[PDB]
Amino acid sequence: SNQALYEKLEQTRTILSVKLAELINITTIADFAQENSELAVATTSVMMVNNQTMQLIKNVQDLLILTRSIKEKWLLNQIP
Amino acid sequence: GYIQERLKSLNDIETQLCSMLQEASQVTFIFGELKRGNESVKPQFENHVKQFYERLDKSTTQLRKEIQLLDENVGTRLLPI
C-alpha cells in the first residue's frame, strides 16, 4: 500500500514535467484578414498556456492529496 | 518528537507546493504580457519556469523520502496492517 504511494508520486511528477515542457514550447512571440480572424493565433496561444496551467494546478493538487495521506498515516497509526 | 518532525516536514512540503502554484500563476500572467508585446518581463518568465522545475524536483524528492520513512516505521512507530 506504500508502493501505491511511490507509484502515484512517480506518475504525478511525470505529468508535471510533461505539462511544463509543453508550456515551454508555446511560442512567446508577440502578437489575409479572414484567415487571421478565423485562426486567432495569438488568442489561441494564451488559451493553450492557461490550459497547461489548469493542469499544473490539478497535478499539484494530487501532490497535496498524497502529502495529506502521509500526514494521516502518522496521525492515525502511531502506537499510543 | 519523531512524529512531530515528520508532520513538520510534511507541512514544509505543503508550503513548497503552494509556492509552485504561485510560480504557475506568475508564468501564466507573464505569458499574457509577452504576447501583448511587453518583452520587459521575459527574464522573469524564464526565472519562474526554472523555479517551478526546481521546486517540482525538491518537493517530489522530499515526498519520496517521506514515503520511505513510512515504510521503515511499520512495526516500530506505526501499527502494521
Swiss-Prot record, chain A:
GO terms for biological process: positive regulation of transcription by RNA polymerase II; positive regulation of transcription elongation by RNA polymerase II; positive regulation of transcription initiation by RNA polymerase II; RNA polymerase II preinitiation complex assembly. One of its GO terms (cellular component) is mediator complex. This is Mediator of RNA polymerase II transcription subunit 22. Component of the Mediator complex, which is composed of at least 21 subunits that form three structurally distinct submodules. The Mediator head module contains MED6, MED8, MED11, SRB4/MED17, SRB5/MED18, ROX3/MED19, SRB2/MED20 and SRB6/MED22, the middle module contains MED1, MED4, NUT1/MED5, MED7, CSE2/MED9, NUT2/MED10, SRB7/MED21 and SOH1/MED31, and the tail module contains MED2, PGD1/MED3, RGR1/MED14, GAL11/MED15 and SIN4/MED16. The head and the middle modules interact directly with RNA polymerase II, whereas the elongated tail module interacts with gene-specific regulatory proteins. It comes from the Eukaryota. It comes from Saccharomyces cerevisiae (strain ATCC 204508 / S288c). Belongs to the Mediator complex subunit 22 family. One of its GO terms (molecular function) is transcription coregulator activity. The chain holds residues 2 to 89 of 121 of the full protein. The modification N-acetylserine is found at residue 1. It is found in: Nucleus. The lineage of its organism: Eukaryota, Fungi, Dikarya, Ascomycota, Saccharomycotina. Keywords: Acetylation, Activator, Nucleus, Transcription, Transcription regulation. Present with 2181 molecules/cell in log phase SD medium. Component of the Mediator complex, a coactivator involved in the regulated transcription of nearly all RNA polymerase II-dependent genes. Mediator functions as a bridge to convey information from gene-specific regulatory proteins to the basal RNA polymerase II transcription machinery. The Mediator complex, having a compact conformation in its free form, is recruited to promoters by direct interactions with regulatory proteins and serves for the assembly of a functional preinitiation complex with RNA polymerase II and the general transcription factors.
Curated annotation (Swiss-Prot), chain B:
It is found in: Nucleus. Changing residue 21 to K: Results in a decrease of TFIIK and RNA polymerase II occupancies at active promoters. Keywords: Activator, Coiled coil, Nucleus, Transcription, Transcription regulation. The keyword Zinc does not apply. One of its GO terms (cellular component) is core mediator complex. The keyword Nucleus applies. GO terms for molecular function: TFIIH-class transcription factor complex binding; transcription coactivator activity. Present with 396 molecules/cell in log phase SD medium. Component of the Mediator complex, which is composed of at least 21 subunits that form three structurally distinct submodules. The Mediator head module contains MED6, MED8, MED11, SRB4/MED17, SRB5/MED18, ROX3/MED19, SRB2/MED20 and SRB6/MED22, the middle module contains MED1, MED4, NUT1/MED5, MED7, CSE2/MED9, NUT2/MED10, SRB7/MED21 and SOH1/MED31, and the tail module contains MED2, PGD1/MED3, RGR1/MED14, GAL11/MED15 and SIN4/MED16. The head and the middle modules interact directly with RNA polymerase II, whereas the elongated tail module interacts with gene-specific regulatory proteins. Belongs to the mediator complex subunit 11 family. Component of the Mediator complex, a coactivator involved in the regulated transcription of nearly all RNA polymerase II-dependent genes. Mediator functions as a bridge to convey information from gene-specific regulatory proteins to the basal RNA polymerase II transcription machinery. The Mediator complex, having a compact conformation in its free form, is recruited to promoters by direct interactions with regulatory proteins and serves for the assembly of a functional pre-initiation complex (PIC) with RNA polymerase II and the general transcription factors. This is Mediator of RNA polymerase II transcription subunit 11. It comes from Saccharomyces cerevisiae (strain ATCC 204508 / S288c). The gene is MED11.
